[PDB]
Amino acid sequence: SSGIVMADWLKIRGTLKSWTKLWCVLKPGVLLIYKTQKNGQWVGTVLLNACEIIERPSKGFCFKLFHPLEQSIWAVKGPKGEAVGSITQPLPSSYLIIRATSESDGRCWMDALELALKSG
């Protein structure tokens, strides 16, 4: 009933190239990012509807979510009404660079992300 298409750890490159491991959940039209896997501290929600996706060779496997018009990709409000995201390494306003453990995992995420873009 959840509507959760995918959930797994992904590494997200900050502006500070710290590659933090964060818990990521995919629901139609949104990617929800958390510090921890269960009942986690919300960091941000990416509005996939405003986004396009491109592959980024080469290390594992990296892909980039970006706003084609260089605008903000981020939800104003948390899934639970949260005003502000949990503090993390600084992240870009208009794009996100993401890494997955395996090529197969990465391709799955990416394909799933593609469908998710125009739904919700």
Residue numbers in the entry: 6 to 64, 67 to 127
Which sentences from the paper describe this structure?
The oxysterol-binding protein (OSBP) and its related proteins (ORP, for OSBP-related protein) have emerged as central regulators of sterol/lipid transport at the junctions formed by ER with other organelles. Critical to the transport function of ORP5 and ORP8 is their recruitment to the ER–PM MCSs.
To understand the structural principles of ER–PM tethering by ORP5/8, the structure of the ORP8 PH domain was determined by X-ray crystallography. A distinctive feature that stands out, however, is the presence of an unusually long 25 amino acid stretch forming an extended β6–β7 loop (His209–Ser236). Comparative analysis of electrostatic surface of ORP8 PH domain with Osh3p PH domain reveals a distinct positively charged cavity, representing a putative PtdInsP-binding region. The analogous surface on the Osh3p PH domain has a neutral charge suggesting that ORP5 and ORP8 PH domains may possess a distinct PtdInsP-binding mechanism. Notably the side chains (green triangles) mediating canonical PtdIns(4)P interaction with OSBP, Cert, and Osh3p are missing in ORP5 and ORP8.
